[PDB]
């Protein structure tokens, strides 16, 4: 278990490898955070979120 194979590479969402290293990205409506791993919503209703 290396890079993306080990706990999604610490990425909140999409994880892919380009040159023995992790690169995280996010779905529409989200923006990669400062740590380059987390995905921060942009609006009041980002995709894939339940509101309980």
């Amino acid at each position: 278990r290396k890079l993306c194979s080990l706990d999604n590479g610490d990425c909140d969402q999409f994880c892919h490898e380009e040159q023995n290293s992790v690169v995280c990205s996010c779905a529409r409506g989200y923006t990669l955070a400062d740590n380059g791993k987390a995905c921060i919503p942009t609006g009041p209703y980002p995709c894939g979120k339940q509101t309980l």
Binding site: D12, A27, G48, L52
Partner: protein
Amino acid sequence: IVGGQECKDGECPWQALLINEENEGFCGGTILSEFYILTAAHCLYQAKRFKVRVGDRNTEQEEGGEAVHEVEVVIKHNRFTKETYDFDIAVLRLKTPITFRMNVAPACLPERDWAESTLMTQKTGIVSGFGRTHEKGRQSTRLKMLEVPYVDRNSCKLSSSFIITQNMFCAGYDTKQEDACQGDSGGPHVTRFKDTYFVTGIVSWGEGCARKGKYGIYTKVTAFLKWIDRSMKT
């Protein structure tokens, strides 16, 4: 849905319901954005003309968040065939944009490569709908959801009396009486990942419902992601 629980307030907001001229629900769908609904192509022949309802959890009791939407464009995959139900996918463009709220929100569209090695490798997916609670029973008035384990592709093919193409995948239980059913077709199959839900399938078909040695057959969304983005682009 056979077994499982009912979707509680705010639990399955991406659920859409296709209704006929008589306001009867015949299929489900998944909200992808304010203008687009993902559903199954085989649902398109069920009614000569239908509309799309969102924010509904109880067909006989307005919760106040319900909203009907007319369909402006029906984008069907030209390769769909009733003979095998292969390419059972369609996208619907709504005339008026959906207003997101408590029980109305879009599910996320993942990237293909990431979805297959990470989402579809998870242990379970979530399917939901207003379909039958038993194989020979009637349609449910309450929106239901069910956690369904991903099935090994080998077991899938070996258990199916019908061909399982590369655009389908199995989910559910071998003997446990839980499974999607008639009326749930076109509905959402989503996979949770770190509190975020991603569209991973479309309820397609099955041999009966919850039958032993049989699984629920779903359209493999990851195989049409590029296609889906194109249908939404125009």
